[PDB]
Amino acid sequence: PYRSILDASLELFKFTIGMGELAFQEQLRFRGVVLLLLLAYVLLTYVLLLNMLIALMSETVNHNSWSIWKLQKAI
Amino acid sequence: FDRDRLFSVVSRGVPEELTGLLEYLRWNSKYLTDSAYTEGSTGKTCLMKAVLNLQDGVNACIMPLLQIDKDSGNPKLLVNAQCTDEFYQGHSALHIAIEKRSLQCVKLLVENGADVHLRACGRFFQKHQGTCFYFGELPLSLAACTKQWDVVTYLLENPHQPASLEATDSLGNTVLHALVMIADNSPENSALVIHMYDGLLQMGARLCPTVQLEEISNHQGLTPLKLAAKEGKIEIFRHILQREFSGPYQPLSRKFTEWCYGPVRVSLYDLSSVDSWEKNSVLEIIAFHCKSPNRHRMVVLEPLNKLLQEKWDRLVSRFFFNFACYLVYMFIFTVVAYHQPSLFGESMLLLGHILILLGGIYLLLGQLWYFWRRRLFIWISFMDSYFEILFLLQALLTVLSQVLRFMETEWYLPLLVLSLVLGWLNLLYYTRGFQHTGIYSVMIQKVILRDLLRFLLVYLVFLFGFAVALVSLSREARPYRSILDASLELFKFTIGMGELAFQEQLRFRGVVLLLLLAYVLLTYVLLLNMLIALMSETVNHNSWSIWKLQKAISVLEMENGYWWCRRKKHREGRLLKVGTRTPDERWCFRVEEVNWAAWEKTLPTLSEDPSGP
Amino acid sequence: SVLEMENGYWWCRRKKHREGRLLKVGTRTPDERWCFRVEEVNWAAWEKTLPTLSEDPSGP
Amino acid sequence: LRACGRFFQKHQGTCFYFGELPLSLAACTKQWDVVTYLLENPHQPASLEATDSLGNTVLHALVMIADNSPENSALVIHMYDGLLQMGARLCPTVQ
Ligand SMILES: CCCCCCCCCC(=O)OC[C@H](COP(=O)([O-])OCCN)OC(=O)CCCCCCCCC
Hints:
The structure is cut from a larger assembly and holds four copies of chain A.
Chain A: H1 5-13, H2 32-61, H3 65-74
């Protein structure tokens, strides 16, 4: 399962790309705690992605960019 | 000559039919204040009934009735009578005269020795839920809460019964406390309260100059500025903190102006019972003792914004020092948890465990001291005192796991892992030390949280129902064997690993496929509804002031130091003389402004020459 | 939702209660009407021009 | 008379830079009578061009303190025009 920090970080990062493995591993002495901890990570990760989406929508809807492009043209 | 005859004559205002009252009252050896003449069980007398209805603001039956009462030889004066019942107690005839907007009637009753200081401490006059109108239960305060200037002017300058502008009620409130206590954020009420607060202050300047009306406290120990801060009344809060008067009414001002040079002006705001040197300052009351949604609104107003900015600029070095200490403690706690044995290196691991125990005990003691000092702050505001709760929780877990390490049991490692996880989630507190991450941290618990809880409730209901459905339907043979396994398989659709296959092993397989498709559709409905509702809540947007409130709470805790050492507390501002009231020296805060439109040199200045900070 | 609940269940019909109080509003000989008590606070209406049914405040 | 003190130099903190000249001080105060009297008095006439320690003239000083606010911008624009039209008929040799 998880043997190193790099491997566990790679397995945990795959939840954002849609390949997060979530299984009830019947090989560890503490398995329900690992399952609950994975669920908590999934919840907090969805909090982070949702917060980023909401904050960036809020920044955009309260909108300039045409003149910034013209400044890039002048440079 | 029964009571109903009196209460019918005085309801008409005719004075001629009062004949026969003096003779019968002298013959029967009775009194006009007796319970026989009282209107029912409520306690109402004849004069209050005569006052209650008026013909063009005047009654021709009041003065003859008072003459009859004077001629009757009453041991107790009828104009000072009170109702004395459960709901409507202490309500005198002068209050009703003030109510009906008849200055002439108020004059008519006060000419004959009406007691001005009569407290009306009934249930209707006390502030409570239901039906009430609290106004300070005094005729002076009643006129102050009615928006009447003639009546209060006559009451404060009459030769018969002068009204003391300071007068405590049963709750301890004065006229200023009562005028602060009933206030809205609405433009109609706020202008009323502000203008007549100013009027009463300027009246008390020349009526009772020996006493300080602002520096008085009620039974709760709050000045009207502190009462406005605690009750959340912000419209009078700004005006009290920012009031400037030019002329003879100079000492009752708080926004003095030191000097002007063209467009730049240096002005001194007042910090009297405002800065954190006082035990019950306005900043502490706003941050900790106020239960109102307008808390963050009361922080970003001058001079509190610049004062708290100065305090943060002075304490940011200790803020980042605490951040560095917590980061080092979590690095040591992570290294030890990474190198746990199977359940020189051993001595180093024992030293690491000792350091973990010491840090956990330190954090637990600090959090317990904070909870002892701020026990009401949790009930007042959960969304401002939750990290501390988390800073408590893992801390005791940090202790508890070590206890389970001492007993050499199985569950010491899961508790250590949860301590590590909760400690790394507790690192987001110090993100309030920067402005961008500080604004970011507001959204993570305020708006998204309620939507996430309701979404989790609906999703858990749907997930449990569908899990039981696929468990019960898949038992018959021609996958899902338990509720936990089926819930785990069904939850994977939200993370992109939902297995959707036509299982050719069950007797009912098309029903299972259709049921899975229905679950997918309803799950997408739930996620889409959450997204739409949270976008709708966000687009109709505050958060900058909420971050500033978190800054003010952060600095006020840091000025108290740690639990083991109490730091010295420094006064903000300078002690400068603002006038000859014999000198009037005040502690003040220097605020610099630039105004390119104010080009009139009319107002005087304290200092004739510019000077630096 | 509430209007369906005032009809009770299909097996038992619940008693239905009148809302408000029966009070006299004028001599039209009396004009007694069933009415609902509504409390309001207005800090701008300071003119005592309109007459009132009751001269003294009372509770609900 | 140049007033080259720390208060009159442009820096962070407390200051009011205006070109450290009485002509430029009247130009940064929104006063037309005082500048009109200073530029056309027979005793001590005021040269509209006059370098300060930073090299700024009255026009440079009037540009240097300016906001994007409507109150300051109208002031600066109108009296920039006024000083230019005054220098047209007062010192027409120089630009
Ligand atoms: C041997 C006895 C020594 C006692 C004194 C130790 C020095 C004081 C440590 C300290 O500054 O604690 C503050 C820090 C942050 O807590 P908080 O007030 O921000 O709480 C905010 C909650 N909202 O809290 C921590 O970081 C706890 C860490 C404990 C170990 C410190 C190691 C220092 C390494 C240099």
